[PDB]
Amino acid sequence: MKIEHVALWTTNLEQMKQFYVTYFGATANDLYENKTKGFNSYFLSFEDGARLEIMSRTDVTGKTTGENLGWAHIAISTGTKEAVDELTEKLRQDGFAIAGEPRMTGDGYYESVVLDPEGNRIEITW
Amino acid sequence: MKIEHVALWTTNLEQMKQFYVTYFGATANDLYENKTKGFNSYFLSFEDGARLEIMSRTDVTGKTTGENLGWAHIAISTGTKEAVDELTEKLRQDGFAIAGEPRMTGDGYYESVVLDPEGNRIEITW
């Protein structure tokens, strides 16, 4: 038993795909489509481990206000401290929101926290 | 680069820990605590791959109404079709909500969908 994937409801599917592909080295599979339900999805694969399922459908439309009970974030590890700093700066210069500057957290992670094109939290870990 | 963990805001931390430990074979680490911010957390490890970070803090209190933009669910694989059926039934008999009966989905997964003690979606995959 293990986590096969984590899924994300998205409003602009292609914009999101090319974000994770550009910045986190993800590989996309073929677009899946269910015209009847207005549903579209991609599975993004990383080096190994869990995949990210990005999906959208015409009825999934509501935005959540702040920090609430439920799924909180995902953490992508980069392997080193230097890697977190380098990626956080590439994202900054490309205009993304840096919610958390790189640092050692009290629970022992060297990470930064950035927001994807639709505001979702991602911890960029070593 | 890869997904190190997926995090979940929780209202009853211990209840949630023993759920994932009981049903999905997860192993918990030591409770982390930041008394100043009212924060508590556990990291649950599976066979390998991404971990599940279950956390709570006195200010994270709001519930989200339906299916919205943002993190959608996580999928735990069990390895076989038979395993999905067996686990979905154990969960049913123990009173958990079966949102989706086991079946082959159009995107090629044999899975069921159950709700954890706090209503979060989990796809139980083969």
Distances (CA, A) of A2 to A44, A115, B25, B126: 17, 26, 9, 10
- In chain B, how many domains are there? 1
What residues of chain B lie within 8 A of the CB of A73, using their CB?
6-7, 71
Q: Are B102 and B125 in contact (CB under 8 A)?
A: no
In chain A, which residues are last before a break of more than 2.5 Å from C to the next N?
none
Cα distance from A28 to chain B (closest Cα, Å)?
A: 14
Q: Which residues in A lie closer than 8 A to residue B68 (C-beta atoms)?
A: 9, 60-64
What is the CATH number for A76? 3.10.180.10
Question: CA-CA distance, A74 to A102, in Å (whole number)?
Answer: 16
How does DSSP assign chain B, residue by residue? -EEEEEEEE-SSHHHHHHHHHHHH--EE-PPEEEGGGTEEEEEEE-SSS-EEEEEEETT--PPP-SS-SEEEEEEEE-SSHHHHHHHHHHHHHTT--EEEEEEE-TTS-EEEEEE-TTS-EEEEE-
Residue B9, judged by CB atoms within 10 A of its CB (0-12, 13-18, 19+), counts as buried
Q: Which domain holds residue A54?
A: 2-126
| A9·B125 Cβ contact <8 A | no
Question: Which H helix or E strand runs over A66?
Answer: none
Question: Are the Cβ atoms of B68 and A9 closer than 8 angstroms?
Answer: yes
Q: How far is A88 from chain B, CA to nearest CA, in Å?
A: 14
CA atoms within 13 A on the CB side of A13: 20
Write the residue in A1, A46, A68 that is nearest to B1 by C-beta. Answer: A46
Task: Quote the DSSP letter at residue A58.
Answer: T
Most distant CA pair in chain A, distance: 48
How far is A28 from B41, CA to CA, in rounded Å?
A: 32
- Which residue type sits at A46? F
Q: Which of A11, A70, A107 sits opposite B64 (nearest CB)?
A: A70
Mutate to test the interface with A, among B37, B44, B71, B121 (most CBs of A within 10 A): B71
State CA A109 to chain mean position distance: 18
Partnered with residue B8 across adjacent β-strands are: A71, B54
